[PDB]
């Protein structure tokens, strides 16, 4: 019944997707750049017959058009036996400017989401990228050659909308978007609407106010000429995944297929595959406790010998070990008060952002970072005091300057007062006692790291 209610918005009934409120875009390019005409790849013709009825049909929506450029790029196919074209606009990609990506990454995205909204509903928009229209300026960019040896039509097309491969349309689609949204954002108070390129989330506080702000939503995407994919939308569930993370009253989860994506790794024998390895992982650094200590061995061989010894074996266990065994984070909470549980050994600060959960204290973060070269020289009772202020920095980015608690295996308010060079800084933000509180000592548990009665 959402499916008739409104016809428009879905990529099913709603036909092709064209940002109506957008202007057709124009693709600046580099200084120095020159057009590259590259050669057309010699297609297979069981390639070439799969590929053909995708390119008329992209022909009939008028989304490739004929033309005449300097430009010319690959189109290769791609993977049963249904060919799909894939343009290789790397040699482009090199040619246009740099953007500032102003995409925030899934996380920190999710990271803007309060408990108080618990009813959910996930959408994504079918053919994102296509919505927007390329200004016949640009269009030559984005020629390649187009040939059919069985009709002998050795000719060239382009694409009259922002195609795929080509390195800016993420971003260029995710500032298209929140612009086009910022209408329906304003109007809905009530609502939390949240935005990765194509992936939207929106929660509210009750069902209903769910059910009513889906329909809007979904008016408005069909008002703007954006399409959604009605197959795979999750709407007014208390349950949702979104981004490759499970969100559940209050609470969220690392889904199974984002630990695939790191658990499917085969162990790293070159330092590249190694480096990849822990940059996938590192996303999943504020579900690992102890993290940065823990991938202590991994990071040396970079750039060296790879030695993959016992100590690098047990290191890549654990990670995933650790990711088998990752919690359940709950939602950080803005009207509430944080604490925050630290701990350091070996120069590796570690600890634990916690808030409030009935009588219990459910963590919303593991925060993990190394000490500067600098300060992991430092005495023991002084890379704590090191420790507690690097990670207090990272919650900052958590709780929004909101109350927050201290607690440590050895206190030291002390020390931060009368140190007998660096302190003028950490007196900046840990003796402004408006957002910072301390607590007694209290030695925590190596592995959940909360208190111990």
Same mark, same amino acid.
């Given at each position: 019944?959402?499916?008739?209610?409104?016809?428009?918005?879905?990529?099913?009934?709603?036909?092709?997707?064209?940002?109506?409120?957008?202007?057709?875009?124009?693709?600046?390019?580099?200084?120095?750049?020159?057009?590259?005409?590259?050669?057309?790849?010699?297609?297979?013709?069981?390639?070439?017959?799969?590929?053909?009825?995708?390119?008329?049909?992209?022909?009939?929506?008028?989304?490739?058009?004929?033309?005449?450029?300097?430009?010319?790029?690959?189109?290769?196919?791609?993977?049963?036996?249904?060919?799909?074209?894939?343009?290789?606009?790397?040699?482009?990609?090199?040619?246009?400017?740099?953007?500032?990506?102003?995409?925030?990454?899934?996380?920190?995205?999710?990271?803007?989401?309060?408990?108080?909204?618990?009813?959910?509903?996930?959408?994504?928009?079918?053919?994102?990228?296509?919505?927007?229209?390329?200004?016949?300026?640009?269009?030559?960019?984005?020629?390649?050659?187009?040939?059919?040896?069985?009709?002998?039509?050795?000719?060239?097309?382009?694409?009259?909308?922002?195609?795929?491969?080509?390195?800016?349309?993420?971003?260029?689609?995710?500032?298209?978007?929140?612009?086009?949204?910022?209408?329906?954002? !304003?109007?809905?108070?009530?609502?939390?609407?949240?935005?990765?390129?194509?992936?939207?989330?929106?929660?509210?506080?009750?069902?209903?106010?769910?059910?009513?702000?889906?329909?809007?939503?979904?008016?408005?995407?069909?008002?703007?000429?954006?399409?959604?994919?009605?197959?795979?939308?999750?709407?007014?569930?208390?349950?949702?995944?979104?981004?490759?993370?499970?969100?559940?009253?209050?609470?969220?989860?690392?889904?199974?297929?984002?630990?695939?994506?790191?658990?499917?790794?085969?162990?790293?024998?070159?330092?590249?595959?190694?480096?990849?390895?822990?940059?996938?992982?590192?996303?999943?650094?504020?579900? !690992?406790?102890?993290?940065?200590?823990?991938?202590?061995?991994?990071?040396?061989?970079?750039?060296?010998?790879?030695?993959?010894?016992?100590?690098?074996?047990?290191?890549?266990?654990?990670?995933?070990?650790?990711?088998?065994?990752?919690?359940?984070?709950?939602?950080?909470?803005?009207?509430?008060?944080?604490?925050?549980?630290?701990?350091?050994?070996?120069?590796?600060?570690?600890?634990?952002?916690?808030?409030?959960?009935?009588?219990?204290?459910?963590?919303?973060?593991?925060?993990?970072?190394?000490?500067?070269?600098?300060?992991?020289?430092?005495?023991?009772?002084?890379?704590?005091?090191?420790?507690?202020?690097?990670?207090?920095?990272?919650?900052?980015?958590?709780?929004?300057?909101?109350?927050?608690?201290?607690?440590?295996?050895?206190?030291?308010?002390?020390?931060?007062?009368?140190?007998?060079?660096?302190?003028?800084?950490?007196?900046?933000?840990?003796?402004?006692?408006?957002?910072?509180?301390?607590?007694?000592?209290?030695?925590?548990?190596?592995?959940?790291?909360?208190?111990?009665?």
């Amino acid at each position: 019944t959402w499916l008739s209610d409104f016809p428009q918005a879905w990529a099913e009934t709603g036909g092709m997707g064209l940002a109506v409120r957008q202007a057709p875009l124009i693709i600046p390019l580099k200084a120095t750049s020159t057009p590259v005409s590259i050669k057309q790849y010699p297609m297979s013709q069981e390639a070439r017959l799969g590929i053909k009825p995708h390119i008329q049909r992209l022909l009939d929506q008028g989304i490739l058009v004929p033309c005449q450029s300097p430009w010319n790029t690959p189109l290769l196919p791609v993977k049963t036996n249904d060919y799909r074209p894939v343009q290789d606009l790397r040699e482009v990609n090199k040619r246009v400017e740099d953007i500032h990506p102003t995409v925030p990454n899934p996380y920190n995205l999710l990271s803007g989401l309060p408990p108080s909204h618990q009813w959910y509903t996930v959408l994504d928009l079918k053919d994102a990228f296509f919505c927007l229209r390329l200004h016949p300026t640009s269009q030559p960019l984005f020629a390649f050659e187009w040939r059919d040896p069985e009709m002998g039509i050795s000719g060239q097309l382009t694409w009259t909308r922002l195609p795929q491969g080509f390195k800016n349309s993420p971003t260029l689609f995710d500032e298209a978007l929140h612009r086009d949204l910022a209408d329906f954002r !304003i109007q809905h108070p009530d609502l939390i609407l949240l935005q990765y390129v194509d992936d939207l989330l929106l929660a509210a506080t009750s069902e209903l106010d769910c059910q009513q702000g889906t329909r809007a939503l979904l008016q408005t995407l069909g008002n703007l000429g954006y399409r959604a994919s009605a197959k795979k939308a999750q709407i007014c569930q208390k349950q949702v995944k979104y981004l490759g993370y499970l969100l559940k009253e209050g609470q969220r989860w690392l889904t199974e297929a984002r630990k695939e994506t790191v658990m499917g790794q085969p162990t790293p024998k070159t330092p590249r595959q190694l480096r990849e390895f822990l940059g996938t992982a590192g996303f999943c650094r504020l579900w !690992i406790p102890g993290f940065a200590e823990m991938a202590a061995p991994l990071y040396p061989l970079t750039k060296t010998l790879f030695n993959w010894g016992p100590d690098q074996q047990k290191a890549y266990q654990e990670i995933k070990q650790a990711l088998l065994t990752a919690p359940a984070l709950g939602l950080p909470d803005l009207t509430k008060p944080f604490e925050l549980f630290v701990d350091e050994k070996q120069g590796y600060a570690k600890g634990v952002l916690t808030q409030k959960l009935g009588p219990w204290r459910r963590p919303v973060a593991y925060l993990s970072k190394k000490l500067d070269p600098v300060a992991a020289g430092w005495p023991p009772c002084l890379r704590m005091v090191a420790a507690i202020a690097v990670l207090t920095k990272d919650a900052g980015k958590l709780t929004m300057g909101q109350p927050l608690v201290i607690k440590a295996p050895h206190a030291v308010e002390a020390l931060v007062k009368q140190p007998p060079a660096r302190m003028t800084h950490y007196q900046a933000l840990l003796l402004d006692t408006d957002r910072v509180q301390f607590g007694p000592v209290v030695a925590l548990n190596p592995a959940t790291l909360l208190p111990l009665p």
